[PDB]
C-alpha cells in the first residue's frame, strides 16, 4: 500500500546522479536529503524502505550515537572524518540510524547542526536521517536535513503486509484454510521481522511433526507466543 | 569430553535448543521454507545448576566443534592473540565453534579491566551484528552468580532467547548428582533419591556443595567408599551457610 | 502524437549545429539531421550546407531530407523532387536514395531508377544504383528486381558498395526464407566469388547477403553444403564461418558451446571476431550467461567482441561496468567502437559518460563519433541487419556514406 | 587535518548586495576590505597606512556569510580564510608548524589577506596551557609586524567571553562594533539581486515577502530563495508566483520557528 509512496520518495532520492536532464539543466538541486522515522522503529522498517537504493549503489550505515557518550567528549571530529570520507567517496549514500556536560552537548549539537547543513559544501552526497521518534529530537534538525519532503509510516492498509507476506510466502507451503485478511488486518504496527518471525516460528513449530505444510491453527498458535510476549511487559 | 553419559536432566531444554544450535548443523535447508537467521545466543539465569558448562561442552562435543572461551580460564587466555581480531580470525578459520565464558561467572579496577572485556564483547557483537565471516558462530552467556548484572540487564529477552531456570527439572539436583556420583568411587547400597530430593530451598548448587563439602568427611574418616551418611552430613554442612 | 505530447528543445541544433567544423562535425550534423525524424530549423537554414561538406556529406545531407520524411508521400515527393535530375552525381543519387527511404510500399520509384541502371562500365547510375538499390531494398522473394540485380552481381564494379547494397538489398529482401534456398542466384554469386580471390571486401560483404538469404532456416543442411563446397583457403572459409554466424540462430546445442570454447583459440583473428561476435545474436535472451572473463585476456579483439556483444537492451549496470574498462583505450578502433554500443544499450544516464569522453579525449574520428553518440545517446531482422553490416567500420571512410542511412532506428 | 584542504577558498558565491540590513556597517567594513585594494596609492599618499580592519561579534545572525561574500567580491585574487575549530585537537604542537606554514603561504602570496574565524574555539582563558600556546602564539604572530602588520584584522565570533583576545585586540584590532542584525527592510535587496534566476513574475512584491519573514538568518533566507524555485519547478511550471508557495513560506518559518 506504499508503492506510490516508495516510488515518490524513490524519485525524490534517485534524481541526483541519475536522470540528469531533469536534475541540473532545469535546476532542481536539492542538496540536503530527507529525514525518515518509524513508530515501530527497529531499523528493519526504515531499512526495508531505504533498501531499494542499496540494490545498485554504495551504502554507508552508522547506527546509534552511543560513540559520543561512551567516551570523552572528543566532539564532532568523527562526523568530520565521515564528511571527508564522504567527499572522497562522493558516489555513495549517507544514512544515520538511531539518532538519540550539558554545555558541551549544546555546542556539539549546534556544531553538528551547522556541519550537517553544509554551508561550505554543495551537492556531493545525500544524507538521510533516521530515529525512533521525531518528537524526542529537537526540531532544529529539520531545516538542514528535511527541506524537500517528509513521510510518515502508514497504517495496515492490507496491501503492504499482503505484498510482503506474498514475497516471504512465494515458495512456502501453506494450507487452504490459512486466510490472509485476518492476519494482515489483525496485526497493527508490525515490521517485516515480526511477520517473518511468526512465519519462522510457525514453520519451526510445524516441523515438530515432520509436517512440511503449515496450518492456520499452528500459525495462530505460534502467534500467541508473540502476542503474549509483547503484552507481558 | 563430557558427552551425554556425563550430563542429563534437561531433555526438554535440549529438545528446545536443538533448533537454536543444531539447526545449522544437520538441516540447513529450511532457510527458504522458514526464513531463519543467526540469533545472538542463549543464556540460563538463576542458581548454578552444577553442569552449566558441561552442557555447552556436551553440545559442542556432539557438534564436533572447538571450544574457545574469551576470558581464558585454563591457559587459553593469551594462546589465541589489540587482542580483539585474533578471535575473529580463528573464528573465520574454524567455522564450527561455541563460545562460553566461565571465569567471568573491587568496582574500581576489577570493573575497569572487566569493563574492557565487556567493551571487547560489545564491539565483537557490533562487528558480528554488522557483518559476518562464517556461520556457526554463537555466544552463550552465564548468569549463575550474584555479580552477574550486565548480562542479565542487557539481555531482557527482546532480541535474544530467555529460559526461566530456577527449577530446571529437579534432575539438576537428582540425576546430575548421580552422574557426579558415577565419577567418584560409589558403593552399591546408596539411595541418592531421598538425599537428593530432601534439599529444597537453599540453592541448586546442592550437588557440588554436597560432593565437595562431603569430601572433607570422606577425607576425615578416610573411607574407601562414600556412604549416604556422609552426604547426610554434607546437607547440614551446606545449609549452615544459608 | 510525437509532435503533440513531446517537444524537443532547440539546444541540440544550437550546440551540435554550432560546433560544426573540419568537415566531420558537419557529418555529425548530418547524423543528427539525418536521424532527427519535430524541429526542422537546420533543414530550412538556407542552402550551401550540403555543398560545404564532402561527397559523403553530400550523400548524407541529400538523404537526410528523405530520412526525415517517412510521412506525407506528397510532401516528401514535393521536397525531394527538387534534388532529382540535378547536376551533381551525389545529389541525384542521394535523391533517389531519399525516394527509397521516404516510403516502403509505394514502389512507384522503381521505373525511373532501374530504367537507367544498365550501363555496366561507368555512369551516374552506379551511385544511383547505390542509393536506388539500397533504398529499394529497404522498401522490401521479389524476382523482378533480383533478376535485374543479376547483371549487377555479374558486373562487379570497382566500387565495393555496389555489391554491398546489392547483396544486402536482396539479402534483406530474402531474410526469413523457409529453410533457406540453394537457388542459382546466390549459387551464381558463390561461383563468381570463387572465380577470383581478390578484393577481400567482397569476401566480407558478400557473406552478409548470403547469410541474410540463409536467414529463417529451421532444418537447413545448407551450412553443411557450404562446409562441403565452400571450404577452401581461409577467405572463403571465412565466408563459411559467416554462414556459421547465420547458421546457429538458437536451440539446445551445447555442443556449439563446448566446441566454441574449443575453437576459442583459433589462429585466424577474424573468424573469432565474427563467429564469436555471433554471441550477442545466439544467446540474446538468456543474458545471465553472456558476461564472462573475455576482457581479462590480452586479445583486445575479443574485448571488441564483448564490446559489440553488449547489445541494445535496457542496459543493466554490468554492461555499463564493461563500458567503464572498455571505454579507456588508446587505439581509435576500440575508443571509436565503445560509444556506439554504449549509447545503443542505454537509450537516462547519458551526460556523465560524455563528460568522461571529454575528460579522456580533451582525433577527428573520436570527435565526430563522440558527437554522434551525443545525439543518439538519449526480435526483428530490420534492427539486426544495420549494425551487423556496420561491423566493418575499421576501414576506409567510404563506409561513412552508408553509415548515415541505417534503418536500425525508429 | 581537514583545515589544510578546507583552508583554500574558491568557487565564488553570494555577492555584495546580500548583506543583512547593514547600511552603514557595510561601508565601515567595505572601506577596509575593498577600498584599500582598489586604491592602494590613495591611502599611501593621502595618509600614512590603510586601515587595519573591523570586528564583528555578539549575536550570530548571518555570520560567516559576509566573509565568504568578501571572497566573492574580490577583484584580483580570492583570499584565504582560516577557521579556529581545527586548532584545538589531540596531540597538540602541530599548531606551530601549521600557523608557520599558512603564514608562510601568506608570504608566498605577496602578503595576501588572511581571515581568522571562530576565535571562541581557542579563546576564553578565564591544564589549558596547550590552548595558551596556540592562542598566545597566534596573537604573537598577529600583533607582531614581522610577517605583516597591515593586511587585515577581523574576528567573527559568537561568544565574547574571550579574556585574552579582548585585552590584546587594542594592539592591532579596532572597530569594536556590534553585529548589526538585519532589520525588516533589509531583505528586499536580497530579493532584488536574487531575482536573477529563472524569469519570476513581477506580481511578487519584494517588500511584502521581505516583511513577511522575521528573524531569518542569511542562510535561512537563502534556503527560502532556493525553495522558491524548488517548489516553483516541482509543479512542472515555468513561472514562480508567491501564491504558489506562500503557505510553504509562512509554514517553513512559522511551523519551523514556533
Swiss-Prot record, chain A:
Key words of the record: Acetylation, ATP-binding, Cytoplasm, Deafness, Intellectual disability, Isopeptide bond, Lipoprotein, Membrane, Myristate, Nucleotide-binding, Nucleus, Phosphoprotein, Proteasome, Ubl conjugation
Single GO biological process annotation from the record: proteasome-mediated ubiquitin-dependent protein catabolic process
Example of a GO MF term: proteasome-activating activity
Transmembrane segments: none
Residues noted as binding ATP in the record, renumbered to the chain: 38-45
Lineage: superkingdom: Eukaryota
Presence of keyword Nucleus: yes
UniProt feature coiled coil, ranges: none
GO CC annotation terms, alphabetical: cytosol; membrane; nucleoplasm; nucleus; proteasome accessory complex; proteasome complex; proteasome regulatory particle, base subcomplex
UniProt-annotated location(s): Cytoplasm; Nucleus; Membrane
Principal location: cytoplasm
Cross-link (Glycyl lysine isopeptide (Lys-Gly) (interchain with G-Cter in ubiquitin)): 49
Keyword Nuclease: no
N6-acetyllysine: residues carrying this PTM: 70
Membrane topology reported for the UniProt record: Lipid-anchor
Family note: Belongs to the AAA ATPase family.
Function: Component of the 26S proteasome, a multiprotein complex involved in the ATP-dependent degradation of ubiquitinated proteins. This complex plays a key role in the maintenance of protein homeostasis by removing misfolded or damaged proteins, which could impair cellular functions, and by removing proteins whose functions are no longer required. Therefore, the proteasome participates in numerous cellular processes, including cell cycle progression, apoptosis, or DNA damage repair.
Protein name (database record): 26S proteasome regulatory subunit 4
Record gene name: PSMC1
Parent-record interval covered: 189 to 433 of 440
From Swiss-Prot, chain B:
Keywords: Acetylation, ATP-binding, Cytoplasm, Nucleotide-binding, Nucleus, Phosphoprotein, Proteasome
GO terms under cellular component: blood microparticle; cytoplasm; cytoplasmic vesicle; cytosol; cytosolic proteasome complex; extracellular exosome; inclusion body; membrane
Modification type N6-acetyllysine: residues: 78
Molecular functions (GO terms): ATP binding; ATP hydrolysis activity; DNA-binding transcription factor binding; general transcription initiation factor binding; proteasome-activating activity; TBP-class protein binding; thyrotropin-releasing hormone receptor binding; transcription factor binding
Region listing for May mediate interaction with PRPF9, in residue ranges: 42-242
Keyword flag rRNA-binding: no
Residues binding ATP: 46-53
Subcellular location: Cytoplasm; Nucleus
A Gene Ontology BP annotation from the UniProt entry: regulation of transcription by RNA polymerase II
Primary location class: cytoplasm
Family: Belongs to the AAA ATPase family.
Subunit structure: Component of the 19S proteasome regulatory particle complex. The 26S proteasome consists of a 20S core particle (CP) and two 19S regulatory subunits (RP). The regulatory particle is made of a lid composed of 9 subunits, a base containing 6 ATPases including PSMC5 and few additional components. Component of a complex with USP49 and RUVBL1. Interacts with PRPF19. Interacts with TRIM5. Interacts with NDC80. Interacts with PAAF1. Interacts, in vitro, with the thyroid hormone receptor (in a thyroid hormone T3-dependent manner) and with retinoid X receptor (RXR). Interacts with ERCC6.
Protein name (database record): 26S proteasome regulatory subunit 8
Native source species: Homo sapiens
Curated annotation (Swiss-Prot), chain C:
GO BP annotations listed: proteasome-mediated ubiquitin-dependent protein catabolic process; regulation of protein catabolic process
Keywords: Acetylation, Phosphoprotein, Proteasome, Repeat
Keyword Phosphoprotein included in the entry's annotation: yes
Per-repeat ranges for PC: 60-93, 94-130, 131-162, 165-199, 208-237, 366-378
Compositional bias annotation for Basic and acidic residues: 271-291
GO MF assignments: enzyme regulator activity
Signal peptide span: none
UniProt modified residues of type N6-acetyllysine: 199
Known tissue expression: Found in skeletal muscle, liver, heart, brain, kidney, pancreas, lung and placenta.
Region of interest called Disordered, as start-end residue ranges on this chain: 271-293
One cellular-component annotation, GO: cytosol
Modified residues annotated as Phosphoserine in this record: 16, 18
Superkingdom, natural source: Eukaryota
Binding partners and assembly: Component of the 19S proteasome regulatory particle complex. The 26S proteasome consists of a 20S core particle (CP) and two 19S regulatory subunits (RP). The regulatory particle is made of a lid composed of 9 subunits, a base containing 6 ATPases and few additional components including PSMD2. Interacts with RPGRIP1L. Interacts with CRY1 in a KDM8-dependent manner.
Role description: Component of the 26S proteasome, a multiprotein complex involved in the ATP-dependent degradation of ubiquitinated proteins. This complex plays a key role in the maintenance of protein homeostasis by removing misfolded or damaged proteins, which could impair cellular functions, and by removing proteins whose functions are no longer required. Therefore, the proteasome participates in numerous cellular processes, including cell cycle progression, apoptosis, or DNA damage repair.
Family, as annotated: Belongs to the proteasome subunit S2 family.
UniProtKB/Swiss-Prot annotation, chain D:
This protein's UniProt keywords: Acetylation, ATP-binding, Cytoplasm, Nucleotide-binding, Phosphoprotein, Proteasome, Ubl conjugation
GO biological process, one term: osteoblast differentiation
Residues with PTM N6-acetyllysine: 258
Induction: Expression is not cell cycle-dependent and occurs throughout the cell cycle.
Superkingdom: Eukaryota
Location(s), subcellular: Cytoplasm
Stated name of the protein: 26S proteasome regulatory subunit 7
Full-protein interval shown: 159 to 422 of 433
Amino acid at each position: 500500500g506504499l508503492d506510490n509512496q516508495i516510488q515518490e520518495i524513490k524519485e525524490s532520492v534517485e534524481l541526483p546522479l541519475t536522470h540528469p536532464e531533469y536534475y541540473e539543466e532545469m535546476g532542481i538541486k536539492p542538496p540536503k536529503g530527507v529525514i525518515l522515522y518509524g513508530p515501530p522503529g527497529t531499523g528493519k522498517t526504515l531499512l526495508a524502505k531505504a533498501v531499494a537504493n542499496q540494490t545498485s549503489a554504495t551504502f554507508l550505515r552508522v547506527v546509534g550515537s552511543e560513540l559520543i557518550q561512551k567516551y570523552l567528549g572528543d566532539g564532532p571530529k568523527l562526523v568530520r572524518e565521515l564528511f571527508r570520507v564522504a567527499e572522497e567517496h562522493a558516489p555513495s549514500i549517507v544514512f544515520i540510524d538511531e539518532i538519540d556536560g550539558e554545555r558541551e552537548i549544546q555546542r556539539t549539537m549546534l556544531e553538528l547542526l551547522n556541519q550537517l547543513d553544509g554551508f561550505d559544501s554543495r551537492g556531493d552526497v545525500k544524507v538521510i536521517m533516521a530515529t525512533n521518534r521525531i518528537e524526542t529530537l529537537d526540531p532544529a534538525l529539520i531545516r538542514p536535513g528535511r527541506i524537500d519532503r517528509k513521510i510518515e509510516f502508514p497504517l495496515p492498509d492490507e496491501k503492504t503486509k499482503k505484498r510482503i507476506f506474498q514475497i516471504h510466502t512465494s515458495r512456502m507451503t501453506l494450507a487452504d484454510d490459512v486466510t490472509l485478511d485476518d492476519l494482515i488486518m489483525a496485526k497493527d504496527d508490525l515490521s517485516g521481522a515480526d511477520i517473518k518471525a511468526i512465519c519462522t516460528e510457525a514453520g519451526l513449530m510445524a516441523l515438530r511433526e515432520r509436517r512440511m505444510k503449515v496450518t492456520n491453527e499452528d500459525f495462530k498458535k505460534s502467534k500467541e507466543n508473540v502476542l503474549y510476549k509483547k503484552q507481558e511487559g | 569430553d563430557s558427552t551425554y553419559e556425563m550430563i542429563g536432566g534437561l531433555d526438554k531444554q535440549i529438545k528446545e535448543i536443538k533448533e537454536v544450535i543444531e539447526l545449522p548443523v544437520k538441516h540447513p535447508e529450511l532457510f527458504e521454507a522458514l526464513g531463519i537467521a543467526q540469533p545472538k545466543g542463549v543464556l540460563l539465569y538463576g542458581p548454578p545448576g552444577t553442569g552449566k558448562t558441561l552442557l555447552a561442552r556436551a553440545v559442542a562435543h556432539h557438534t564436533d566443534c572447538t571450544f574457545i572461551r574469551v576470558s581464558g580460564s585454563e591457559l587459553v587466555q593469551k594462546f589465541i592473540g589489540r587482542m580483539v581480531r585474533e578471535l575473529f580470525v580463528m573464528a573465520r578459520e574454524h567455522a564450527p565453534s561455541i563460545i562460553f565464558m566461565d571465569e567471568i561467572d573491587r568496582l574500581e579496577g576489577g570493573s575497569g579491566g572487566d569493563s574492557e572485556v565487556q567493551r571487547t564483547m560489545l564491539e565483537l557483537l557490533n562487528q558480528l551484528d554488522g557483518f559476518e565471516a562464517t556461520k556457526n558462530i554463537k555466544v552463550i552467556m552465564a548468569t549463575n552468580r550474584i555479580d552477574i548484572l550486565d548480562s542479565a540487564l542487557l539481555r531482557p529477552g527482546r532480541i535474544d532467547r530467555k529460559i526461566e531456570f530456577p527449577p530446571p527439572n529437579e534432575e539438576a539436583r537428582l540425576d546430575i548428582l548421580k552422574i557426579h556420583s558415577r565419577k567418584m568411587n560409589l558403593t552399591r547400597g546408596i539411595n541418592l533419591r531421598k538425599i537428593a530430593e530432601l534439599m529444597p530451598g537453599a540453592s541448586g548448587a546442592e550437588v557440588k556443595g554436597v560432593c565437595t563439602e562431603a569430601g572433607m568427611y570422606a577425607l576425615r574418616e578416610r573411607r574407601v567408599h562414600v556412604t549416604q551418611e556422609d552426604f547426610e552430613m554434607a546437607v547440614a554442612k551446606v545449609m549452615q551457610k544459608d | 502524437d510525437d509532435i503533440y505530447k513531446t517537444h524537443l528543445e532547440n539546444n541540440r541544433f544550437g550546440g551540435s549545429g554550432s560546433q560544426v567544423d573540419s568537415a566531420r562535425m558537419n557529418l555529425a550534423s548530418s547524423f543528427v539531421n539525418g536521424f532527427v525524424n519535430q524541429d526542422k530549423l537546420l533543414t530550412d537554414d538556407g542552402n550551401k550546407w550540403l555543398y560545404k561538406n564532402k561527397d559523403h556529406g553530400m550523400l548524407s545531407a541529400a538523404a537526410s531530407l528523405g530520412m526525415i520524411l517517412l510521412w506525407d508521400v506528397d510532401g516528401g515527393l514535393t521536397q525531394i523532387d527538387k534534388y532529382l535530375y540535378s547536376s551533381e552525381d551525389y545529389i541525384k543519387s542521394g535523391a533517389l536514395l531519399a525516394c527509397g527511404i521516404v516510403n516502403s510500399g509505394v514502389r512507384n520509384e522503381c521505373d525511373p531508377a532501374l530504367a537507367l541502371l544498365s550501363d555496366y562500365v561507368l555512369h551516374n547510375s552506379n551511385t544511383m544504383r547505390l542509393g536506388s538499390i539500397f533504398g529499394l531494398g529497404l522498401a522490401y522473394n521479389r524476382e523482378d528486381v533480383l533478376t535485374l540485380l543479376l547483371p549487377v552481381m555479374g558486373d562487379s564494379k570497382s566500387s565495393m558498395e555496389v555489391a554491398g547494397v546489392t547483396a544486402l538489398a536482396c539479402g534483406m529482401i530474402a531474410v526469413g526464407s523457409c529453410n533457406g534456398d540453394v537457388t542459382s542466384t546466390i549459387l551464381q554469386t558463390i561461383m563468381e566469388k570463387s572465380e577470383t580471390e581478390l578484393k577481400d571486401t567482397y569476401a566480407r560483404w558478400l557473406p552478409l547477403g548470403l547469410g541474410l538469404n540463409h536467414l529463417g532456416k529451421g532444418e537447413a543442411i545448407e551450412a553443411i553444403l557450404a562446409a562441403l563446397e565452400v571450404v577452401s583457403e581461409p577467405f572463403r572459409s571465412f565466408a563459411n564461418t559467416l554462414v556459421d554466424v547465420c547458421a546457429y540462430a538458437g536451440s539446445g546445442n551445447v555442443l556449439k558451446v563446448q566446441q566454441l570454447l574449443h575453437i576459442c583459440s583459433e589462429h585466424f583473428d577474424s573468424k573469432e571476431k565474427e563467429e564469436d561476435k555471433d554471441k550477442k545474436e545466439k544467446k540474446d535472451k538468456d543474458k545471465k550467461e553472456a558476461p564472462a572473463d573475455m576482457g581479462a585476456h590480452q586479445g583486445v579483439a575479443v574485448l571488441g567482441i564483448a564490446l559489440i556483444a553488449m547489445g541494445e537492451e535496457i542496459g543493466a549496470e554490468m554492461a555499463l561496468r564493461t563500458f567503464g574498462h572498455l571505454l579507456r583505450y588508446g587505439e581509435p578502433t576500440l575508443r571509436r567502437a565503445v560509444p556506439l554500443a554504449l549509447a545503443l544499450i542505454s537509450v537516462s544516464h547519458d551526460a556523465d559518460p560524455e563528460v568522461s569522453y571529454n575528460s579522456i579525449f580533451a582525433a577527428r574520428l573520436a570527435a565526430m563519433l563522440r558527437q554522434l553518440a551525443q545525439y543518439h545517446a538519449k526480435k526483428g531482422t530490420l534492427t539486426l541487419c544495420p549494425y551487423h553490416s556496420d561491423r566493418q567500420l575499421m576501414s576506409q571512410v567510404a563506409v561513412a556514406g552508408l553509415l548515415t542511412v541505417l534503418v536500425s532506428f525508429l | 587535518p581537514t583545515v589544510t584542504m578546507m583552508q583554500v577558498e574558491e568557487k565564488p558565491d553570494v555577492t555584495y548586495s546580500d548583506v543583512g540590513g547593514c547600511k552603514e556597517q557595510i561601508e565601515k567594513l567595505r572601506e577596509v576590505v575593498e577600498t584599500p585594494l582598489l586604491h592602494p596609492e590613495r591611502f599611501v599618499n593621502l595618509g600614512i597606512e590603510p586601515p587595519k580592519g573591523v570586528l564583528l561579534f555578539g549575536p550570530p545572525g548571518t555570520g560567516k556569510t559576509l566573509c565568504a561574500r568578501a571572497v566573492a567580491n574580490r577583484t584580483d585574487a580570492c583570499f584565504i580564510r582560516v577557521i579556529g575549530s581545527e586548532l584545538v585537537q589531540k596531540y597538540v604542537g602541530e599548531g606551530a608548524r601549521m600557523v608557520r606554514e599558512l603564514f608562510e603561504m601568506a608570504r608566498t602570496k605577496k602578503a595576501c589577506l588572511i581571515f581568522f574565524d571562530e576565535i571562541d574555539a581557542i579563546g576564553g582563558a578565564r591544564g589549558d596551557n596547550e590552548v595558551q600556546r596556540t592562542m598566545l602564539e597566534l596573537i604573537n604572530q598577529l600583533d607582531g609586524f614581522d610577517p605583516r602588520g597591515n593586511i587585515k584584522v577581523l574576528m567573527a565570533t559568537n561568544r565574547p567571553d574571550t579574556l585574552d583576545p579582548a585585552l590584546m585586540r587594542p594592539g592591532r584590532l579596532d572597530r569594536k562594533i556590534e553585529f548589526s542584525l538585519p532589520d525588516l527592510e533589509g531583505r528586499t535587496h536580497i530579493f532584488k539581486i536574487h531575482a536573477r534566476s529563472m524569469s519570476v513574475e513581477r506580481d511578487i512584491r519584494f517588500e511584502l515577502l521581505a516583511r513577511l519573514c522575521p528573524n531569518s538568518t542569511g542562510a535561512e533566507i537563502r534556503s527560502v530563495c532556493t525553495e522558491a524555485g524548488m517548489f516553483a519547478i516541482r509543479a512542472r511550471r515555468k513561472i514562480a508566483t508567491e501564491k504558489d508557495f506562500l503557505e510553504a513560506v509562512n509554514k517553513v518559518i512559522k511551523s519551523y520557528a514556533k
